[PDB]
Design a binder for this molecule. Structure first.
Ligand SMILES: NS(=O)(=O)c1cc2c(cc1Cl)N[C@H]([C@H]1C[C@H]3C=C[C@@H]1C3)NS2(=O)=O
Ligand SMILES: NS(=O)(=O)c1cc2c(cc1Cl)N[C@H]([C@H]1C[C@H]3C=C[C@@H]1C3)NS2(=O)=O
Ligand SMILES: NS(=O)(=O)c1cc2c(cc1Cl)N[C@H]([C@H]1C[C@H]3C=C[C@@H]1C3)NS2(=O)=O
Ligand SMILES: NS(=O)(=O)c1cc2c(cc1Cl)N[C@H]([C@H]1C[C@H]3C=C[C@@H]1C3)NS2(=O)=O
Ligand SMILES: N[C@@H](CCC(=O)O)C(=O)O
Ligand SMILES: N[C@@H](CCC(=O)O)C(=O)O
Ligand SMILES: N[C@@H](CCC(=O)O)C(=O)O
Ligand SMILES: N[C@@H](CCC(=O)O)C(=O)O
Lengths: 260, 270, 270, 260
């Protein structure tokens, strides 16, 4: 029996191969999530088929509709069996889907173009000269929306009352907006994506401040499924054996094309 | 019915209070873990009484008997209901007991005695003999050791990376014993061992000791791996889901961050 | 029964919101006074609707007709129940209407246009033409004025200190009118008047304007006196005691300084 | 009819002159509060008799007794008619006596022995090497006891669990303890007292940090007294005419016995 693996097109997690138009099947994708999925399948023993989620959204609940979109929606409704992707572990997701022990740690970073008049998030919040945005239907936007600290609440109040819309459709759009806004635009993305972007050509962006909090990426599976404990133990073995560290090193610092 | 919360005596998670000769109950102890238990009960209401393991061991397995001891040992054989203490999430433990999502992240580090200020324009710089685990593995002068019945001892026992394999091979036949029965014994052996002993321990404890008087020890290199701390619970329990959801609630609410900042860096001196 | 609250259009006390056209009710306005009224209602429960006085005057007793105008003017004749706005506690006002304890301290300052940086080793210095109120009184080049129907105009009218008496005597015979009908008119006269005009106004407004774009204005000297802002109430209304106790609660709970820090220094452009 | 005025032996508010053994009545006292009382009596038109409060207490409620002591207790129980003294306006006091509009602004300050390594209050809260205390039965200790902010609650928790007792009976004892503890002891006193102390021989103490809050000193009368509105209007007139400014200048800087 096949196993549908709903993923996202995120780099270096899943990529299009350099000659992917001559390849059909699982061979046409490469990345950290593909290698992770291969090791999960090898440890468990199931034949898997990588599929891309239909809408490039990780997943959230709509405004007064109670419908899950994206990969989480792909999982709740049974169209998907497992989600090996940069899926952030949260409360709202845990109430409807079950994660694994996180396989990669991360936080909320800040990305700007290359004196550093921003400093940490406090000085970022004090000044309205510089603009900043997040990814719609993500964990960072919902982190700010539900935040009860003063600084984060003021940040969220700014973000919702911004014209034109400051939220970006994809992280590629957000990075392009950081690059093309001559230092006026800032990005609140997950620190792992920030590092990968800051290590690649043309390498004109850099990360300031520490991460605002700390989270993890989990491997999702429908509630009550029989794939929960096996993938949990798979993640634990992969972390204890250094495989997860090795894959992050291969896909994050092995190439490392910039001067530093 | 009340539940028993098993906990180790380790700073700054749980330290016996100064005037604890006459306080009784949950008020005898203080630290990070007691605040975590307070917030856990605040999320979901339950009566809890703190307990400390008799052997004071974190948890591992006996050999040729296959017995769990320590905190995990008490949790396996029913004598505990929940272990709110810095218990590391591992493969062997996850099989027999359940874990919440980690409430704090960590990593194995190396502790050495802080070096002197090298005088030779008129600038003082830090000069250390160890900068990673590779050079600590190759050299045979500066000894090193771990905490008995911990997660790091098992980590080195079953690892396949060559440098960690050599480190374990050295540790297994070190006379006198390089292992320490407690965290404080290891740190004191570092302090008294005249810079001839390097201690392998979690980065949270290492940072905490580094930022407190007399602050003559420092953490070197980087973390050899990444792990976490969760609230354990025996297999087949009704507390697993409420505990995990409480962990997520506390993480998004930022209470864990405040607790760490106020028990690790806000009270630190020197 | 709901109470009506009289308030002036002043910054950062009550400013119409950016999208105030589509918003209606207490959501139209924002600033220090709005959330001060919010916390006042939270402490002692009542329903309130905000208003802005049609004359836009702070309140001063006219001659001949002996009629109060402005905020105090409408508060004398029962057109409001509580005035949450920067109303200055004076002698003439207190004998007619009641005040709470001051919720914010202030004092008369001088606003001048910020001079250009003096070129003269390679350091830039600031040389200002005014350093106190004495030199402002002596010279006859740099003109000065105040806000009509305010506490400052009365303060200079009623004072007996020799230097303040001279300042008032000069102000009364000033062609053209050195008096301004609003705070913004005075500050614009300062910014346009190319350093020939010095504005006398409260230090709270002066600091707030100094910290915003284009910050071409400077506050010189120290405070000429010391006064405060209280929540006014008509003489006889039972609201006076709850209002006073609410002021004390908010001050000791450290929220008045919080609102001041958030609306004055936190959003500091310059 | 005579008017009993309950004051407190505080400098420069009330002093015992220098040769008081040959003087009687109001003529054996000198200070800012004495001059203020003279101005009040002149404005209202009443003969007054200055009386030192029996115990050097400003006023508070006992622990689980609900009895007022000091000047506030002197007024509540009808033994006193008016209290011209450095009496801080608070919530608990306002519920039992009437305060006029404040006549002298002030706040909570820190004095230390003679750039400080602490300065602001957060640093003073972090470092436990250096001790600090307040005046018992005051408003500063009351301010810390009921404070709901994090830093001030931490300060109060430290202060109550201090051995030996860090609280002082008199501000004279507190200043002597700041001077005699070789820079190891800090003090939390009102800014006005701190300035008067720092402007006097031997000028060995200095004030650091900003004001923790801002308060005022009021003129107390018993609840429902006929002397409330007249003394209120007297304070307002005195402030509007510059008399309070002049008296503070006379008793705080006119002498100015220090090198600065
Ligand atoms: N260095 S890293 O970001 O690639 C990374 C991050 C993590 C790893 C392993 C690696 Cl290599 N394992 C942990 C897991 C291991 C056990 C303890 C926490 C979870 C369960 N999650 S993690 O702390 O998010
Ligand atoms: N800064 S810290 O060590 O107190 C800390 C550590 C961690 C936090 C949150 C904080 Cl504040 N969240 C994660 C949890 C939150 C959700 C995502 C990963 C797990 C489930 N565990 S963690 O990565 O171990
Ligand atoms: N920092 S500020 O100007 O917003 C400010 C100003 C003042 C505050 C409190 C604050 Cl936060 N409290 C006092 C009040 C408190 C008690 C003592 C004097 C009055 C009654 N009024 S005040 O001296 O005018
Ligand atoms: N400069 S000072 O401390 O001597 C000082 C302090 C103050 C003064 C007058 C002086 Cl001189 N008057 C005010 C009062 C006057 C009117 C406005 C606020 C109260 C009622 N109280 S105050 O703001 O606490
Ligand atoms: N991958 C994240 C969202 C991406 C982002 O926050 O930038 C998630 O699963 O929630
Ligand atoms: N925290 C570890 C113990 C520390 C160590 O072994 O270094 C555990 O859960 O076992
Ligand atoms: N607060 C002052 C207004 C400021 C001014 O008039 O200068 C008043 O009540 O009149
Ligand atoms: N004078 C203050 C107390 C003295 C002090 O706090 O230093 C009061 O009346 O509350």
């Amino acid at each position: 029996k096949t196993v549908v693996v709903t993923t996202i097109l995120e780099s270096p997690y899943v990529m299009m191969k350099k000659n992917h138009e001559m390849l059909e099947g699982n061979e046409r994708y490469e990345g950290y999530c593909v290698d992770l999925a291969a090791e999960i399948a090898k440890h468990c023993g199931f034949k898997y088929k990588l599929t891309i989620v239909g809408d490039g959204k990780y997943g959230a609940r709509d405004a007064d509709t109670k419908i899950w979109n994206g990969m989480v929606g792909e999982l709740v409704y049974g169209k998907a069996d497992i989600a090996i992707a940069p899926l952030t572990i949260t409360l709202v997701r845990e109430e409807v889907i079950d994660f694994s022990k996180p396989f990669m740690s991360l936080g909320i970073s800040i990305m700007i173009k290359k004196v550093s008049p921003i400093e940490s998030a406090e000085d970022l919040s004090k000044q309205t000269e510089i603009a900043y945005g997040t990814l719609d239907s993500g964990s960072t936007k919902e982190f700010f929306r539900r935040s009860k600290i003063a600084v984060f609440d003021k940040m969220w109040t700014y973000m919702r009352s911004a014209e034109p819309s400051v939220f970006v459709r994809t992280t590629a759009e957000g990075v392009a907006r950081v690059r093309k806004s001559k230092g006026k635009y800032a990005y609140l993305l997950e620190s792992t994506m920030n590092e990968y972007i800051e290590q690649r050509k043309p390498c004109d962006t850099m990360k300031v401040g520490g991460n605002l909090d700390s989270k993890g990426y989990g491997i999702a599976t429908p509630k009550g499924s029989s794939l929960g404990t096996p993938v949990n133990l798979a993640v634990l073995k992969l972390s204890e054996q250094g495989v997860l560290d090795k894959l992050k090193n291969k896909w994050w610092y092995d190439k490392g094309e910039c001067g530093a």
